[PDB]
Amino acid sequence: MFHPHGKEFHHNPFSVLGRFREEEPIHRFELKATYPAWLITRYDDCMAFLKDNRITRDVKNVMNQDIDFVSDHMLAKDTPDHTRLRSLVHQAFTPRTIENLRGSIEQIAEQLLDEMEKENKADIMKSFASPLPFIVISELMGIPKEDRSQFQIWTNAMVDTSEGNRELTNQALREFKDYIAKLIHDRRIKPKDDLISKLVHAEENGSKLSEKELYSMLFLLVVAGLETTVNLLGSGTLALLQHKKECEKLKQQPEMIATAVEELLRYTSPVVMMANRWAIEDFTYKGHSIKRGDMIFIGIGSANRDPNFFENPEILNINRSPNRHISFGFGIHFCLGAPLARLEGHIAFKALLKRFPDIELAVAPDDIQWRKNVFLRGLESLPVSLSK
């Protein structure tokens, strides 16, 4: 019985999802009221469900049963409404546009590393993996420096998974919205060089984002740019520190960075599972009776370790090529921010290993502290030794 809120999943979700992949790769469970769900752990079956038009991302198809901007973003839409919303933001994440951010991201990395070099130890989360994506997002969205401390408080509170804090989370949502509504108003009138201005002025086939569509879009982008990108950097650093022979390869040959980032995505699966998927009708898959309204959980972490698709899947190989991981999902909803996550990872891992060639883990395996989150696999802290 899969228990995503249980101790074993918190200790190592990869080993739980892997056991399901080998023993019961299509598994019915109850997600805690309670709601029926299916856990899909093999790569081939994950692919089939990612392409299957019997699966919706919009829970209305199945109900049966403001801050409404939070659940109206494009990742909660199917075609054709998804297609329009994606075409209105797409241009913000094309290869040149994102590549053009390189110099600014390098500068943030080097500034954070200058602070870390004042000492011979650090918590990589506090010092480097958490602040870097936050500053990148802040710069990209044009959040003035005087507003960043506050923006950090809101963005942290508004994604809290603690069920009991729901009124307080809703409040932070409302405050985030009011803040961005002021920026949107101001930039519609006087546009600047930032992504809120660019979204406000985007038009495609005669259509623009409405005020509410802007709230939803900026909400989604900010949430993505923060905790999950942080987790790439944190968990990727951890994986490099646990695999010294692969760390040394990359340190000696930084041209390996592009394959290395893809391997770290595969092995660390920052989004370890994803759901928010429902069957629109009853159907059978491999003898299993899927029902209208059943939720589908896509086991990224285990799919990324499936030996039908990856050789020696449990081994970190920073030169793995090709590497057809699904860490960014697949198909319609494939991550929009993938080039930015990849650029941040490229810059950050190279920069850290250049500045601190002697970096080493300063926490025993049993003491490593992971955040409580079913879907997002992320460290609470990451103590390291930097130098003597």
Query: Which residues are known binding-site members for heme?
Result: 335
Measured CA to CA, the distance from residue 135 to residue 259 in angstroms comes to: 25
Kind plus residue range of the DSSP H or E element containing 6:
none
Measured CA to CA, the distance from residue 31 to residue 143 in angstroms comes to: 38
Token reading at 213: 């569509």
What residues from 35 to 64 belong to the interface with ligand HEM (CB under 6 A)? Answer: none
74 sits near ligand HEM (criterion: CB under 6 A)? yes
224 sits near ligand HEM (criterion: CB under 6 A)? yes
The one segment of 119-127, 228-236, 316-324, 380-388 that binds ligand HEM by CB under 6 A: 228-236
Alpha helices in 166-210 (DSSP H): 166-189, 195-201
Compute the least distance from the CB of residue 279 to ligand HEM, in Å.
15
Kind plus residue range of the DSSP H or E element containing 77:
none
Question: How many residues bind to ligand HEM according to rule CB under 6 A?
Answer: 23
SS3 376: strand
Instruction: Assess contact for 37 and 298: CB atoms under 8 A.
Output: no
Compute the least distance from the CB of residue 36 to ligand HEM, in Å.
19
Dump strand ranges (E) for the chain.
Answer: 26-31, 35-40, 55-56, 121-123, 278-279, 283-285, 288-290, 295-298, 360-361, 383-385
Token reading at 93: 């994440």
Token reading at 223: 């949430």
Q: Which is nearer to ligand HEM, 285 or 328 (CB)?
A: 328
Measured CA to CA, the distance from residue 36 to residue 294 in angstroms comes to: 5
Q: Which is nearer to ligand HEM, 180 or 221 (CB)?
A: 221
Compute the least distance from the CB of residue 385 to ligand HEM, in Å.
26
Q: Which is nearer to ligand HEM, 122 or 265 (CB)?
A: 265
The one segment of 97-105, 183-191, 203-211, 323-331 that binds ligand HEM by CB under 6 A: 323-331
Which residue positions form the known binding site? 335
Compute the least distance from the CB of residue 282 to ligand HEM, in Å.
22
232 sits near ligand HEM (criterion: CB under 6 A)? yes
Report how far Cα 127 is from the mean position of its chain's Cα atoms: 20
Instruction: Assess contact for 93 and 341: CB atoms under 8 A.
Output: no
Compute the least distance from the CB of residue 81 to ligand HEM, in Å.
11
Measured CA to CA, the distance from residue 147 to residue 302 in angstroms comes to: 40
Closest to 336 measured CA to CA, from 220, 206, 227: 220
Closest-CB residue for ligand HEM? 337
Q: Which is nearer to ligand HEM, 76 or 386 (CB)?
A: 76
SS3 26: strand
271 sits near ligand HEM (criterion: CB under 6 A)? yes
152 sits near ligand HEM (criterion: CB under 6 A)? no
336 sits near ligand HEM (criterion: CB under 6 A)? yes
Q: Which of 335, 343, 348, 359 binds ligand HEM (CB under 6 A)?
A: 335
CB atoms within 10 A of CB 189: 8
- Return residues touching ligand HEM (CB under 6 A): 74-75, 86, 220-221, 224-225, 228-229, 232, 270-271, 274, 276, 327-329, 333, 335-337, 340-341
